[PDB]
Ligand binder design. Structure first.
Ligand SMILES: CC(=O)O[C@H]1C(=O)[C@@]2(C)[C@H]([C@H](OC(=O)c3ccccc3)[C@]3(O)C[C@H](OC(=O)[C@H](O)[C@@H](NC(=O)c4ccccc4)c4ccccc4)C(C)=C1C3(C)C)[C@]1(OC(C)=O)CO[C@@H]1C[C@@H]2O
Ligand SMILES: Nc1nc2c(ncn2[C@@H]2O[C@H](COP(=O)(O)OP(=O)(O)OP(=O)(O)O)[C@@H](O)[C@H]2O)c(=O)[nH]1
Ligand SMILES: Nc1nc2c(ncn2[C@@H]2O[C@H](COP(=O)(O)OP(=O)(O)O)[C@@H](O)[C@H]2O)c(=O)[nH]1
Ligand SMILES: Nc1ncnc2c1ncn2[C@@H]1O[C@H](COP(=O)(O)OP(=O)(O)O)[C@@H](O)[C@H]1O
Ligand SMILES: [Mg+2]
Ligand SMILES: [Mg+2]
Ligand SMILES: [Zn+2]
Lengths: 426, 323, 412
């Protein structure tokens, strides 16, 4: 099987560097080097993310889409930056304006064809394609607009292969941009109707989880990114490993989406202990479920405790008892019968790889489909209206060839999306 | 908001055809009352059950007459023809377009709209516009303009959905409308190698927008009536190229499943209805559920051979649990 | 004389590798000896690959190892219809190529995992295409039906109410081994909270060895495969008996091993030892096939059983005077060199049809409804060549399996 990553925008891009920083080491691939793999198993399934050309050069099969040179020229001028074949860099030296409209209708719409071109060169690579990974932020141009287009096109070209989306939904407390809800509401819209698996991460849900669950005092972006990339590795790549009970994107999809919206999840990693001290090793297993299922530790902003779950997928990856795994999951399902929805006898989807995260003994990625994420699109949707009402920075959109009915559309859509999700919380 | 889920379901059985009789099929449908059919001992009640010799006139009076009045009253509505291929969907929705006896629901509706208009003609100023498009593989094509392919649904300033760039034609007489339907039917063959295959796998959607303004009263009215001849509900038996002696791969049509979820949601009195599940349900959003009347005519072959398919159809129709 | 076997689904393959292991182990045929007599099917390469990479690597022909690089999908539909279809032909070909090479066979021991994609769906049509190509044989399918509370897949029931209805009208005798109810045995009758799947497999890998292996093997009271279905199914429904083993004692902890027949047989009817969460909560047995192996005196049995026949609290069906097929083999069991199985010199792999499953099916059917009641993951099948029909019409199916398993018992 296979997949083809997609680094839309700067963020989605910045993260690319971290997702590939990791993944590679979790596959023994040095900058341009080959497979130094401490083992021999980190190779029989690599294909999922690379391509064979030389014999020591397995190149990441991702796409780097962005209308701001400097960015990709920071990712390509640093560490692992020199492993991507230049063909991968689909830049847009234009003005990468922070407008969803500027990267979806006017500026991005041009650079698109020169992207799809490659997304096809990579898809028609070889063997059988599974789906595409998509990273980006719903709070900017090259991210929400142009990346949200990249998919609307992808999903017309292969409505068969899957589409996981890793979105950095606009954090609450403080917005790292101003129109944010504009660029956001507009991209979520596109998401709820193309990709079929979305993993929403919040820069501040991370800080928290990174400053209190990792006594880490100076959580640089690199970190946040790093933590995130840690989860997306547990998801995909991982399951493309052996296991007593293994799954793969689809299983994950076909066990997690009760209703076609596409629904968004909230990823959570397992061993998340501070370096030295904490290295408690309390990782027998009840310790991992202890972790994963708590409020804090959910990369999302919202707290599960604020709304039932529809599905859950503990994708563990480290030798354990299909008994102490299958078992724990249960008590968990009974101690919290309250929030776990009922019309699904077994919400949880236990998954079990074998080999764990390179240096760790036992981990377990968590992919939750809780109704709690209602209280986020609400947020976003609110911010919109409060500012849409006055058409705040709307001239930067319309003036870029947009529509007063376009914004209406998205909000509503994504706004209805909130509605539905409640239809199950009850 | 009127009653929430103003969905009526009528089951129409057609006569056994010569192919079924030739095959040796038997008539398995048993009837009771004017609303119940019995298949394999199990009873299925609906708003009405039409036996094999019911007339086009009976079907129109029971299934569409009142909806047409609502449209002229200024409300929206939808009427569907659901069922396996050869069940009687097209016969029901259009029949013989120009035969006064054999014409289906659409011809009779057009006829009644204009006739009503003619009896008004005093202070009311009418304006009728039609649209004719099809959905194949969840892609919309304009049947009035074959260049308009893979169109997209959009919502206007006031939330009302619409097919971006879809031809809207002003009609002034029944004959103009039938000519429009005839053109759409001819245009449909464009870029289609097998029309049988294509017709059974696609959805035809005819829209009649009736606007009126009383020059004196000034009160304006606008109603949209969507007439839909759905794709065959029988996914099974897909012949062709695939796993020769190893196949069973095919899903229920995306729009039919989307329609199922929308109807079930409305039947449950849910405040959230999943219209976005398909382009079809999104376009029909302002005319399906809510304060709109909706009639679904599920059509069935009374053949022993199509027993399992009929069960499915009956079950689909049941999604709208009435009282 | 023989009995081919088709291990379908990752699980049916893991269990397969296991049951297949125990085999050579008690037949003195190391890694590289003769030639198996089965096949391996899966729509996820990486798993069958485990049989291509791991142990018992060269004991198979890359011909009896079928794979569909494509996608597994934890959904019946896709595995049965859409995808699974493409492979079937090829699959069959082997069970027609392997079925020919032999000499007057008896049937195909099928190994699948009820609630899976490749295991539920696929087989559904595999067994399907068999019942027609060899109606004149035995179709005993050995299943691992859904843990009563510890299921895995979110949809599981969808996949198991569908593998039951499609296979029902095609199997001869369906053996059942409950994944969870086996854990209990690993906790309560062996002590270990560290049971790897690789263990449950060693277990069924045992109970199964008692079925085919040893039975098709000479003895003082041989029992052919046909024998089963005959002495085991009272009615055409591909009736599902339950597998049970007796000396499930730990090869470390306790040691009373020397547990004469009189004991090991009583240890079969206590509900805490039956590889199935179908505790005889009321289910009246209606036929049991006590397969013994090792040093056993026929009188010991034709007495140990007599004592049972008169315990009454073990209530057998009415319309059944005597329902005890005593199968005696010679060669004692054969435990893994150093797993965790005791290693006695006699065992009792008793299987049976019990009005008990009236439960297990019930509890699994109900599940289904809850979700179907909301269509839950329905769009996943529809979009895979299925319809409101197959579900609703396979639900009605089992319905008459809840009435069937009710009527054939509880009444006199
Ligand atoms: C001596 C020793 O055992 O060191 C550990 C360690 O101290 C701890 C604290 C690690 C450490 O992780 C962090 O401090 C961290 C920093 C930024 C963001 C997130 C986490 C570690 O850096 C991370 C590193 O993780 C791995 O090696 C995994 O394979 C992981 N790899 C990466 O994230 C990675 C990092 C740099 C370069 C390339 C990859 C992984 C996880 C999931 C999927 C794929 C890969 C491990 C075990 C450790 C150190 C090295 C200190 C922990 O994290 C992980 C992801 O394992 C933090 O809590 C856990 C518990 C570990 O015990
Ligand atoms: N006893 C036993 N049960 C197993 C084993 N592997 C899986 N199972 C059980 O069988 C079911 C899992 O089926 P999956 O592995 O998801 O799927 P599959 O049937 O192989 O086919 P796909 O869904 O297409 O992958 C669960 O109920 C597991 O508890 C095993 O090795 N032994
Ligand atoms: N986790 C994370 N968030 C980022 C990174 N870079 C920008 N962001 C977030 O992305 C949003 C800004 O969008 P940006 O990526 O600049 O848009 P674009 O570059 O025009 O497509 C803010 O909410 C930031 O917190 C990053 O490297 N990691
Ligand atoms: N009620 C009916 N009376 C007589 N013939 C019928 C009846 N319904 C269907 N048929 C005929 O059966 C054939 C197939 O019916 P049609 O409506 O085209 O099927 P579909 O459901 O595929 O649209 C047509 O000739 C049609 O006129
Ligand atoms: Mg037709
Ligand atoms: Mg599998
Ligand atoms: Zn002793």
């Amino acid at each position: 099987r296979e997949i083809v990553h997609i680094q839309a925008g700067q963020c989605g891009n910045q993260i690319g560097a971290k997702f590939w920083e990791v993944i590679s080491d979790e596959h023994g691939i040095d900058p341009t080097g080959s497979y130094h793999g401490d083992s021999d198993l980190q190779l029989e399934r690599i294909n999922v993310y690379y391509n064979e050309a030389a014999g020591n050069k397995y190149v990441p099969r991702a796409i780097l889409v962005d209308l701001e040179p400097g960015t990709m020229d920071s990712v390509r001028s640093g560490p692992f930056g020199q492993i991507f074949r230049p063909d991968n860099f689909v830049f847009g030296q234009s003005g990468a304006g922070n407008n969803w409209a500027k990267g979806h209708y006017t500026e991005g719409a041009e650079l698109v064809d020169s992207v799809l071109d490659v997304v096809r060169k990579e898809s028609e690579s070889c063997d059988c394609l599974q789906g595409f990974q998509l990273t980006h932020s719903l709070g900017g141009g090259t991210g929400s607009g142009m990346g949200t287009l990249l998919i609307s096109k992808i999903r017309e070209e292969y409505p068969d292969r899957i589409m996981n989306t890793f979105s950095v939904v606009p954090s609450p407390k403080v917005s790292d941009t101003v129109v944010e809800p504009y660029n956001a509401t507009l991209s979520v819209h596109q998401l709820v109707e193309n990709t079929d698996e979305t993993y929403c991460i919040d820069n501040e849900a991370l800080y928290d989880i990174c400053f209190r669950t990792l006594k880490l005092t100076t959580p640089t972006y690199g970190d946040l990114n790093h933590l995130v990339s840690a989860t997306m590795s547990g998801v995909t790549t991982c399951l493309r490993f052996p296991g007593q009970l293994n799954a793969d994107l689809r299983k994950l999809a076909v066990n997690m989406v009760p209703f076609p919206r596409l629904h968004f999840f909230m990823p959570g990693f397992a061993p998340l202990t501070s370096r030295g001290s904490q290295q408690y090793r309390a990782l027998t297993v009840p310790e991992l479920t202890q972790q994963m299922f708590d409020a804090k530790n959910m990369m999302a902003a919202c707290d599960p405790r604020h709304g039932r779950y529809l599905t859950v997928a503990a994708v563990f990856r480290g030798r354990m008892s299909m008994k102490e795994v299958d078992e724990q999951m249960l008590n968990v399902q009974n101690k919290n019968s309250s929030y776990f929805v009922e019309w699904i006898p077994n919400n949880v989807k236990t998954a079990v790889c074998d080999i764990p995260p390179r240096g760790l003994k036992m981990s377990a990625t968590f992919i939750g489909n809780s109704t709690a994420i209602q209280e986020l699109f609400k947020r976003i949707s609110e911010q919109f209206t409060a500012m849409f009402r006055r058409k705040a920075f709307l001239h930067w959109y319309t003036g870029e060839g947009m529509d007063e009915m376009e914004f209406t559309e998205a909000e509503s859509n994504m706004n209805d999306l909130v509605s539905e999700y409640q239809q199950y919380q009850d | 908001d009127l009653a929430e889920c103003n969905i009526k379901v009528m089951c129409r059985f057609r006569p056994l055809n010569e192919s079924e009789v030739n095959r040796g099929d038997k008539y398995i449908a048993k009837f009771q009352g004017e609303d119940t059919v019995v298949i394999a001992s199990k009873p299925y009640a609906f708003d009405r059950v039409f036996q094999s010799s019911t007339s086009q006139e009976q079907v129109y009076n029971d299934c569409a007459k009142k909806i047409v009045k609502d449209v002229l009253e200024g409300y929206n509505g939808t009427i569907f023809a659901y069922g396996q291929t050869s069940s009687g969907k097209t016969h029901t929705m259009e029949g013989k377009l120009h035969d006064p006896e054999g014409m289906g629901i659409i011809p009779r509706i057009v006829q009644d709209i204009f006739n009503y208009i003619y009896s008004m003609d005093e202070n009311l100023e009418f304006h009728i516009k039609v649209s004719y498009f099809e959905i194949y593989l969840d892609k919309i094509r304009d049947l009035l303009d074959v260049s308009k392919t893979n169109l997209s649904v959009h919502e206007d300033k006031n939330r009302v959905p619409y097919v971006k760039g879809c031809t809207e034609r002003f009609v002034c007489s029944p004959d103009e409308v039938m000519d429009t339907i005839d053109e759409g039917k001819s245009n449909r063959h464009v870029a289609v190698t097998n029309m049988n295959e294509h017709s059974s796998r696609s959805h035809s959607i005819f829209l009649i927008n009736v606007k009126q303004e009383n020059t004196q009263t000034e009160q304006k009215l606008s109603g949209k009536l969507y007439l839909v001849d759905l794709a065959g509900s029988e996914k099974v038996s897909k012949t062709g190229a695939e796993g020769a002696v190893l196949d069973e791969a095919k899903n229920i049509n995306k729009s039919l499943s989307a329609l199922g979820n929308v109807i079930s949601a409305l039947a449950e009195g849910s405040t959230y209805v999943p219209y976005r599940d398909s382009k079809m349900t999104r376009i029909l959003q302002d005319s399906l559920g809510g304060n709109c009347r909706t009639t679904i005519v599920i059509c069935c072959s009374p053949s022993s051979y199509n027993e399992s398919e009929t069960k499915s159809t009956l079950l689909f129709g049941q999604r709208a649990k009435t009282i | 004389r023989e009995c081919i076997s088709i291990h379908v689904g990752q699980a049916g393959v893991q269990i397969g590798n296991a049951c297949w292991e125990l085999y050579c182990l008690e037949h003195g045929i190391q890694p590289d000896g003769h030639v198996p007599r089965a096949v391996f099917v899966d729509l996820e390469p990486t798993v069958i690959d485990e049989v291509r990479t791991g142990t018992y690597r060269q004991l198979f022909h890359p011909e009896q190892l079928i794979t569909g690089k494509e996608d597994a999908a934890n959904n019946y539909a896709r595995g049965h219809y859409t995808i699974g279809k493409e492979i079937i032909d090829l699959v069959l070909d082997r069970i027609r190529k392997l079925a020919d090479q032999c000499t007057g066979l008896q049937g195909f021991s099928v190994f699948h995992s009820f609630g899976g994609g490749t295991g539920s769906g696929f087989t559904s049509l595999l067994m399907e295409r068999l019942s027609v190509d060899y109606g004149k044989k035995s179709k005993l399918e050995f299943s691992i039906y859904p843990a009563p509370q510890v299921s895995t897949a979110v949809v599981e029931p969808y996949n198991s109410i569908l593998t039951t209805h499609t296979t029902l009208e095609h199997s001869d005798c369906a053996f059942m081994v409950d994944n969870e109810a086996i854990y209990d045995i690993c906790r309560r009758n062996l002590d270990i909270e560290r049971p790897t799947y690789t263990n449950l497999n060693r277990l069924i890998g045992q109970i199964v060895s008692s079925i085919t292996a040893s039975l098709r093997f000479d003895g003082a009271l041989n029992v052919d495969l046909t024998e089963f279905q005959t002495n085991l199914v009272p009615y055409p429904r591909a009736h599902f008996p339950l597998a049970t083993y007796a000396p499930v004692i730990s090869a470390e902890k306790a040691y009373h091993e020397q547990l004469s027949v009189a004991e090991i047989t009583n240890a079969c009817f206590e509900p805490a030892n039956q590889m199935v969460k179908c505790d005889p909560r009321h289910g009246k047995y209606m036929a049991c096939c006590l397969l013994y192996r090792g040093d056993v005196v026929p009188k010991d049995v034709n007495a140990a059983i007599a004592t049972i026949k008169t315990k009454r609290t073990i209530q057998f069906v009415d319309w059944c005077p005597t329902g005890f097929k005593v199968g005696i083999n010679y060669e004692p069991p054969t435990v893994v060199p150093g797993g965790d199985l005791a290693k006695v010199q006699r065992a009792v792999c008793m299987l049976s049809n019990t009005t008990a499953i009236a439960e297990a099916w019930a509890r699994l059917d109900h599940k289904f409804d809850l979700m179907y009641a909301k269509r839950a993951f329905v769009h996943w099948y529809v979009g895979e060549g299925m319809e409101e029909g197959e579900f609703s019409e396979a639900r009605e199916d089992m319905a008459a399996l809840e009435k069937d398993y009710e009527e054939v018992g509880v009444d006199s």
